[PDB]
Amino acid sequence: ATSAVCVLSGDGPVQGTIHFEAKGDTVVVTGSITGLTEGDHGFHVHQFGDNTQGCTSAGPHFNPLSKKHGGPKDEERHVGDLGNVTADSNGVAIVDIVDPLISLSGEYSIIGRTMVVHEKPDDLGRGGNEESTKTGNAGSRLACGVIGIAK
Amino acid sequence: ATKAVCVLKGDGPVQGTIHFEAKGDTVVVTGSITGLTEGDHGFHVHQFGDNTQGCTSAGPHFNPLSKKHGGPKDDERHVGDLGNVTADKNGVAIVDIVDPLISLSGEYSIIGRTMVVHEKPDDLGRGGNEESTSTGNAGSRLACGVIGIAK
Ligand SMILES: [Cu+2]
Ligand SMILES: [Cu+2]
Ligand SMILES: [Cu+2]
Ligand SMILES: [Zn+2]
Numbered sequence: 001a002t003s004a005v006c007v008l009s010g011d012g013p014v015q016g017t018i019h020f021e022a023k024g025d026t027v028v029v030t031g032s033i034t035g036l037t038e039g040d041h042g043f044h045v046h047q048f049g050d051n052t053q054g055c056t057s058a059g060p061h062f063n064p065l066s067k068k069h070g071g072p073k074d075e076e077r078h079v080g081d082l083g084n085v086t087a088d089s090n091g092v093a094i095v096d097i098v099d100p101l102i103s104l105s106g107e108y109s110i111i112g113r114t115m116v117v118h119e120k121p122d123d124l125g126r127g128g129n130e131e132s133t134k135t136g137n138a139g140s141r142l143a144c145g146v147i148g149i150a151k
Numbered sequence: 152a153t154k155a156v157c158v159l160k161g162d163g164p165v166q167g168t169i170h171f172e173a174k175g176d177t178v179v180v181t182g183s184i185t186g187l188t189e190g191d192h193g194f195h196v197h198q199f200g201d202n203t204q205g206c207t208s209a210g211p212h213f214n215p216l217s218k219k220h221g222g223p224k225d226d227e228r229h230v231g232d233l234g235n236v237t238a239d240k241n242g243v244a245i246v247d248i249v250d251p252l253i254s255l256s257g258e259y260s261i262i263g264r265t266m267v268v269h270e271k272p273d274d275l276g277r278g279g280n281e282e283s284t285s286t287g288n289a290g291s292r293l294a295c296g297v298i299g300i301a302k
Binding site: 001004005007017047048049050051052059111112113114145146147148149150151 | 155156158168198199200201202203210262263264265296297298299300301302
């Protein structure tokens, strides 16, 4: 596919629509997320597109190369590590990311996987503790959705 | 990849969980759907995994070979034509299908697409009007979900 979409929903008020478009050897990720607390919120692709137990069954970060967690500009990061989105005072986060590791086809394809927006900021693997190098200390999963093929 | 799952939801009481597993050279579809009216209900793979407008944005039946609608055992059918599921008096439908045209990888892959359960029976392209050749006269989309990768 050349284009994909994901609608984020959860048990709280957070919701959003994320769009993905292949451009060159990158994916451009755009959209908006509402109902967030102002500030940064971790934003990752998780491994499974399984919503049978809400966002908990999505599993860990998508990591086909078996690396530690990092920020999107790091050499050592999960494929699913897209850093943070920032919500304003009204709870609105505008998403505008360009990433060369995620793909919409082939081995690193994210189609059929899950996008998750988290409770806290992602510390980008520089938190100093062990959880930092697994999840970035981003905490709970506020909302999630399976990434589907779009027109 | 080898296993997929879809959680069906809508605006009504209809809900369900569908599992997909590549066994040998075919795909086995199993699960159950609840909240249905007794009788047959059309059960199809629609093209887009886009739920921004509920099940409406899923588009038409997945049809890479550009054929008319039919039943699962016909030569002339859409790839997404999985026939009907049958609900008992309690509104429960058990899904147990083996299909040769769908896949979980490659050109026929349904990963990232949408599973839909419809309001009425699918007439299998035999109703005699133009609509029969598109949707089987299966009617409204009661519940749907995006098909994601499972563990
Ligand atoms: Cu995460
Ligand atoms: Cu990570
Ligand atoms: Cu249909
Ligand atoms: Zn059809």
